[PDB]
């Protein structure tokens, strides 16, 4: 009945926009075919809708954001229940829409999203690779459209007046390329050079204009912090990573999120993390910084307000460096190679941070 | 000197044949730029050569086979030493050339081969994916040509009349696609459906017209068979897998190769394996079969001649099935799900195999 629920797209726009040639400079349009179901899979679809947009700036008008607005208004007209949503989208999401959908998923325990993409948008760009990882960790199931999914989208959203779907040549080849790329970038870990370049606690002398953040999550179970292997991550930056962790999916209780950041939080990130740990009783925050970031502004107040709101703040030493090397780096068997005076630089930085956070004088 | 050692190719044939657009139906030519070095990496190249060929049948004339013949004649004109060879090839090897190069590498302890490919030939085809895995397990270092390697091959093998290399657009994008594809197919494990369909020991009633073979290797160390995690494998067939294991890179001593095959060896594979274990004192062979293959011919003599030449022959039971599920299958966390009457079918098959191998009557 999906065909009765939607205003279908015509064939010559489907085969033009869902052609899965991995590189396709010219298609600056995005098509998103959405269907909504209840949690029982036997059940038929409650509703479906086709959203269109452009791929270029002002992303508030991208099909994903239009879906989010539509879905928010739609859920208010039906009795509250659990939903499983499926997208067939011609381009994978941009970085901003990835963040939006991801934080929506991490905050909503009654929504399951499966995104099928025909092509990977900017698959060569590290920012979009990270965007896909963010979507996946929030819990979106990311997949490349295969022949079956193109056939399904033809049958359900395209005015294919009784005609069957007929694949273009090289559809399976394109799928193989795209699926390998998606798998690789989903499993990607930090480059060793990126690690040692960014987490080195010797005083800045070049580059390092980006901040890298690795994080792990633990739950409590009979007064012992038990790890959650499956919800770790690492992010590169130039709103707040705690807004992308789906705490409602972990084995419910109390949580301890441990942070390892190459630069200590800027003012606004300390503010955002303080906001979060203030409005989330059940989440503890432990920050470990490799270097102290002196923004020439309000960074000290930011760190102090983060510390007052319950977060533990410290500098990385050998232990945390080795942990991050063994967990978040594509080290390839090779062991952690500490630099000289790592411990002494870490101790000096700890003294500086202690002075920063100290409230009462002695 | 690489440029003085070779008869360089002209620019437009280089840019025509080394363009790395992953799909390129029309280029049925292959170009292979070869250089040879000593074990010392500082040392300059001893010799270099450009081989040309066509991509279609009669593979005896493929650039890889031409290199093998040339290299065999070349090594006889220089004092015996260790060699490191580098290929820049426009298409990855076909299945036959993959087998040839792999068995050459696995039998020669004085040769190191690194193959850089511009494009993956038939990357969508399971046979060629397996071919690449075979090349890698024999010890060839398989890699996709990146910008640097195209530049190097331009500088060393192309009559680039003083001009520098200038990349086409989408060279890094194509590299990203191809490198992800190569990585994934190098790491690929057996599909769960493929496994349970092919290793089921209940009597054939359809499909199963191919035989699947997984294998592991162990070395001896003070009378304890210690495994070699890094030299496992699995192969699909419709000459002999023991000719593709590089028994000279493992920590030398005596070896035990354990085989798990969905069908018991045909006559010619039993013959090949008997030949091998006869001419290789230091290698023990342990075969485990899921079903007995009755070729309507000489299979019983083949099995008995394999058994006389020292091989252990048996039928798989729960233990071996679970081992193969846990080792060679992309099981995705899920556990080995035995079928009903697995043990009883295995015991009956063992009785029939014991009648086959029995020599003296009682
Ligand atoms: Zn967007
Ligand atoms: Zn060939």
Asked if B51 and B91 count as a contact pair (C-beta separation under 8 A), the reply is: no
Distance separating alpha carbons of residues A256 and A221, to the nearest angstrom: 12
Q: How far is the CA of A13 from the centre of ligand 1 (A)?
A: 20
B138, B164, B187 - which closes a domain: B187
In A, which residues are within 8 Å of B180 by CB distance? 177, 180-181, 183-185
Report residue A75: phi and psi, to 5°: -60, -25
Residue A221 lies in a domain: yes
Same domain flag for A329 and A204: yes
Same domain flag for B178 and B295: no
Q: What was the elucidation method?
A: X-ray
- List residues, by chain if needed, whose CB lies under 5 Å from ion ligand 2: B 59, 62, 94, 97
Same domain flag for A9 and A65: yes
Residue A308 lies in a domain: yes
Same domain flag for B162 and B45: yes
Asked if A66 and A83 count as a contact pair (C-beta separation under 8 A), the reply is: no
Q: Which residue has the tokens 């092509």?
A: A119
Contact A177 B172 (CB under 8 A): no
Residue B18 lies in a domain: yes
B139, B154, B187 - which closes a domain: B187
Residue A362 lies in a domain: no
Same domain flag for B92 and B222: no
Same domain flag for A136 and A217: no
Q: How far is the CA of A44 from the centre of ligand 2 (A)?
A: 52
Q: How far is the CA of B60 from the centre of ligand 2 (A)?
A: 8
Residue A207 lies in a domain: yes
Question: A8-30: buried (b, 16+ CB within 10 Å) or exposed (e) per residue?
Answer: bbeeebbbebbbbbbbeeebebb
Chain Cα centroid distance, residue A17: 26
Residue B328 lies in a domain: yes
Pick A184's closest partner by Cβ from B23, B123, B183.
Answer: B183
Pick B181's closest partner by Cβ from A124, A172, A177.
Answer: A177
Residue B77 lies in a domain: yes
A148, A164, A187 - which closes a domain: A187
Residue B153 lies in a domain: yes
**3 state SS of B229:** helix
Same domain flag for A214 and A163: no
Which candidate, A189, A98, A95, places its Cα nearest to that of A140? A98
Same domain flag for A26 and A150: yes
In A, which residues are within 8 Å of B177 by CB distance? 22, 123, 177-178, 180-181
Same domain flag for B164 and B204: no
Distance separating alpha carbons of residues B325 and B62, to the nearest angstrom: 38
Same domain flag for B313 and B198: yes
Same domain flag for B217 and B321: yes
Number of domains in chain B: 2
A188 in a known ligand binding site:
no
Contact A181 B183 (CB under 8 A): no
The CATH number for B43's domain is 3.40.140.10
Residue B28 lies in domain: 2-187
B250 vs B81, B260, B287, CA distance in Å?
Answer: 20, 21, 21
Same domain flag for B223 and B238: yes
Contact A180 B177 (CB under 8 A): yes
In B, which residues are within 8 Å of A121 by CB distance? none
Q: Which of B181, B188, B189 should we substitute to test contact with A (largest number of A Cβ atoms within 10 Å)?
A: B181
B62 in a known ligand binding site:
yes
Q: How far is the CA of B134 from the centre of ligand 2 (A)?
A: 14
Q: In A, what residues contact B, Cβ < 8 A?
A: 22-23, 123-124, 170, 172-174, 176-181, 183-185
Q: How far is the CA of B222 from the centre of ligand 1 (A)?
A: 62
Q: How far is B179 from chain A (nearest CA, A)?
A: 8
Structure resolution, Å: 2.6
């Amino acid at each position: 009945q999906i065909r009765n629920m939607v205003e279908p797209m015509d064939p010559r726009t489907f085969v033009s926009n869902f052609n899965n040639r991995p590189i396709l400079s010219g298609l600056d349009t995005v098509w998103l075919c959405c269907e909504v179901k209840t949690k029982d899979p036997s059940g038929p679809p409650l509703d479906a809708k086709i959203f269109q947009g452009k791929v270029y700036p002002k992303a508030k008008y991208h099909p994903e954001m239009r879906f989010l607005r539509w879905f928010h208004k739609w859920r208010q007209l039906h009795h509250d229940q659990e939903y499983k949503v499926t997208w067939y989208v011609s381009w994978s999401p941009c970085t901003r829409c990835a963040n939006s959908v991801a934080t929506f998923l991490a905050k909503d325990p009654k929504v399951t999203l499966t995104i099928f993409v025909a092509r990977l948008y900017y698959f060569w760009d590290p920012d979009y690779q990270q965007a896909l990882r963010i979507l996946a960790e929030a819990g979106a199931t990311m997949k490349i459209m295969n022949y079956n999914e193109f056939q399904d989208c033809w049958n359900k959203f395209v005015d294919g007046r009784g005609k069957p779907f007929k694949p273009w040549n090289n559809l399976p080849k394109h799928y193989t390329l795209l699926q390998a790329t998606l798998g690789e970038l989903l499993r990607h870990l930090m480059d060793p050079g990126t690690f040692t370049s960014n987490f080195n606690n010797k005083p800045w002398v070049s580059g390092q204009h980006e901040t890298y953040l690795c994080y792990k999550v633990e739950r409590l179970h009979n007064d012992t912090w038990v790890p959650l292997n499956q919800h770790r991550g690492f992010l590169r930056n130039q709103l707040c990573f705690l807004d992308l962790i789906p705490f409602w999916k972990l084995d419910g209780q109390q949580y301890r999120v441990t942070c390892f950041t190459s630069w200590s939080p800027c003012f606004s990130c300390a503010q955002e993390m303080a906001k979060f740990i203030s409005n989330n009783e059940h989440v503890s925050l432990c920050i470990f910084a490799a270097r102290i970031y002196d923004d020439q502004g309000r960074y000290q107040e930011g760190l102090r307000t983060l510390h007052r709101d319950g977060a533990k703040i410290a500098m990385m030493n050998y232990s945390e460096f080795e942990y991050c090397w063994d967990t978040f780096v594509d080290r390839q068997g090779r062991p952690f190679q500490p630099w000289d005076g790592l411990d002494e630089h870490s101790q000096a930085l700890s003294g500086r941070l202690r002075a920063i956070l100290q409230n009462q004088g002695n």
